[model samples]
Target: NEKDIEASIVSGNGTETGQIITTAQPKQTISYMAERVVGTGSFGVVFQAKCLETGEAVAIKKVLQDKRYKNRELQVMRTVDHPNIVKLKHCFFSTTDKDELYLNLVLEFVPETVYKVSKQYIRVHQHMPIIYVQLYIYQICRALNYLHQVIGVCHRDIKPQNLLVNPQTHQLKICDFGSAKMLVPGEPNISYICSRYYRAPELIFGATEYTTAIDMWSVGCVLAELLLGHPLFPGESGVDQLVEIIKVLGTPTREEIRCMNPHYNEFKFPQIKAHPWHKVFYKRMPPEAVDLVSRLLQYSPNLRCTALAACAHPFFNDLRDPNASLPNGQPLPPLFNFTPEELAHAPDELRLRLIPEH
Candidate 1:
């Protein structure tokens, strides 16, 4: 099956303040005054650009598109509706004289990423305050719940880098949908998705039948990464990564291996005891915070808490408190503004815990 991607309009370098470019098909031209590359990857380059008329900043992602299948990245971005998810302003296809097709996505620009925010702590010789952890992780759960439940989209890659934050408001938006896909049950998927430090054990064990639980594990890793000031499992290679998990979570029980992959039966290992979760962190980290990470990082995917249910975890209770404010005595970005669609079909228990009385 093949789908032809429409190269609707031309885009050019318009560092000049007033120059404009438009999607002629839409007949609505939007000008980019300047562009500076913000992110670069094997997929393509994303650059920071500005709108001449509004002076609003946007990040435009450019990727090579082939006629292989419709670009699900664009499809997913166009359909997603949530405050925590990055908003897409426009999409235009550009082909240079090389006739190479490229898809360009203009996304609302946020000033910082969780990865960058975390790095700031290292340079300052400080750990990320516990309050910021609660603030950021809760927002992640909210976004993941929306993507997982409401949209059935699995963000194969979930890492601090993809999480965008406004430094002033601390509002987080999940971006970079290049690896996202709706898992159609029984369809084979690549087990080699997601970043290494955040890869779920199921994927490590070569389970193509994995569900969105893989993403949950990545979230677990991210939660721990935020707390530990570095990656929890810094396994250099695929085999090394499994060794890292074993070093902490200990050897996967036969049953745990079965849960990860029914077909994966080569569990030959010397006995190793699971590390206690408390010893896994600083002496001062909250038990509730530790509790949340353990539940999500379970060796067995089924035992892992669903993202929706995770929102109500006691770890996030601090975020739900109406009087909660940042350490600086500033209001926290709105956390409980659940849209009606986000609450539909949710259980009474979940809905009640997700929102707080003003």
Candidate 2:
């Protein structure tokens, strides 16, 4: 039966209303269970629901057929499951109106996002510590590696909001695999979609044949955003972003570019290349953080490290403070720190500018 379903899915022609026994809509009360709206995005609305029988809280993300919902994208997500990637409890269609074909996606409810948790920590404190960033990034790498290597999936969309962290448990959850792809063995590389800021450099050069390295680029971008409190490449478009990358990383040589992707020379690089780079900005970015981020953000996706390699980077070492107690006092190393002056200062400005990045 599962093989039948898989075959139907791979062939791209089947029941428009995909259904699973365990999945159901929020409007429908499942054994007295109800769902409450918790989050929303361009394509769907998310809800927090409870299992009446076990009294367990679960998340239900319903992909509505509004302007932003892509049928193909939703179809891709239906078959994905991994620890680092968001887990799909199940999927179902509306019983009342089968034609509506609403997707009910069961997921784990993460209480807070890493960006949210990090922002709150800074509110009561000062500048964030390197160790805190290291631990969070380490977990992200583990998740990315699992998605890339084991599942043979590419998570094209990775950003701060997509990464959720529970401060109480120090648990990290990587959600939002809506733009994921499954690479069957021996299949040619293909590009589906990715966000502008997180999109890899090779993508800009028009590489149709790419690999999991594209995801590494996003990881690097996220790490940089965590450290700089701003997107490293705030490119308005792909070309502009690629220019920005060239400014910082230096222009990719013809040989290097061609080596990265044989068809690189197809795009015309403007004769006048204005180098844009960060100069004399002496903020304390640890070598490990910078190194890992740079490797991930390298112009060539081929140059990017695997998720496992990124996790093994020395950035995560020496993060725990032996003497200090955390806010919860559970003896785990705290994820944040603050100086006396920073704590004493007014938090209004920081708070106002502090929209959580996902």
Candidate 3:
């Protein structure tokens, strides 16, 4: 058994023949040398591997499999096809001597993460450029629009670490679908989902029937963090999380509370006037940027802007300009190349605003 496993990596007769998987066409055999561990958690481990045949690099995520149940992450990943979303190249099953089975997901390797990139900017004592901020957030919305509207999937975990980026091209891709789910109406779901810093008010209120708007709330937090160079709501605990939000948003009215969760309608909270939006950011910050954040981080889930609507916000107008280029003078990444599936149900007016002039 050890010999067989070793054969999967070692070239036989000076020919590469380590890995194997079936594609859309014929059965293709590929080989990869496991380079290093990229990430790890309770789920399992991710390895950075290089294809011995093509010399291309890939990230392989290995998670333990339960014989009795199917993985929701695999199911959701199979249905996703978008540029802003991480591409799943293929998957294979592996076993250990201990009779344990693991599902290995081969994904395209993105060199850097938004988390690290942002930290680098802070490390250098410079705020992230406003233009880069707009570009990154716009692509994030594009990914969310496809997931929410096209696939009906909710990415419960939306944080900087989950966003992958290419340092040279400045392109962003959303990754890590371990907590993703296709939400069905009237179906009960968990309330204790999403990272604490990005959790929506409805989730904090223990609402089970939340929508993709929860993702929008998370994006709002990301947007604020990119602008402020730190988390907008840094709550150390569940209660403190709400307090952090209340500090800026002030007390939620009965109507707003009912919108977040009907269960909280009768609950009384302290009254505090909402802090001015302008005061929340630097005094010289653009009003449109502040306005966009206000639109996304609302007390009422229904009042939050849809991801597609966020793409059309005035804050992203620079992206719509045909002459727009990165600060380094390089051309911007493809932003208006919308797939038909992406625009199938979008309104004509919104679609026109999203695409730049040819």
Candidate 2 matches the true fold with a TM-score of: 0.72
RMSD, each candidate, Å? 2.9, 12.0, 4.0
Q: Quick one: ranking by TM-score, best first? A: 1, 3, 2
- Put down candidate 2 lDDT per residue, 172-267, tens digits, no spaces: 778776677765545655543677788887677766667788878888887877777667788897778878777777777776587566765654
Per-residue lDDT of model 3, residues 1-358, tens digit only: 2111212335446543347553545656777777678777567788888877788899888887765433588778888999899999877776646867777888999988888989999998889988889988999999999998789898888999889988888899998898888888798888887889999989988888888999999999999999989999999999999999999999888888888888655655778888978889998777888999999999998999999999999999988887888888998887888988888765999988888787
lDDT of model number 3 = 0.84
Regions more than 4 Å wrong, model 1:
1-26, 66-70
| Residues 90-151, model 1: lDDT tens digits | 77665657768787887999979999999999778789988888888888888998998899
Candidate 3 global TM-score: 0.91
| Two-way TM-score contest, 1 vs 2, winner | 1
lDDT of each: 0.84, 0.62, 0.84
TM-score against truth, every candidate: 0.92, 0.72, 0.91
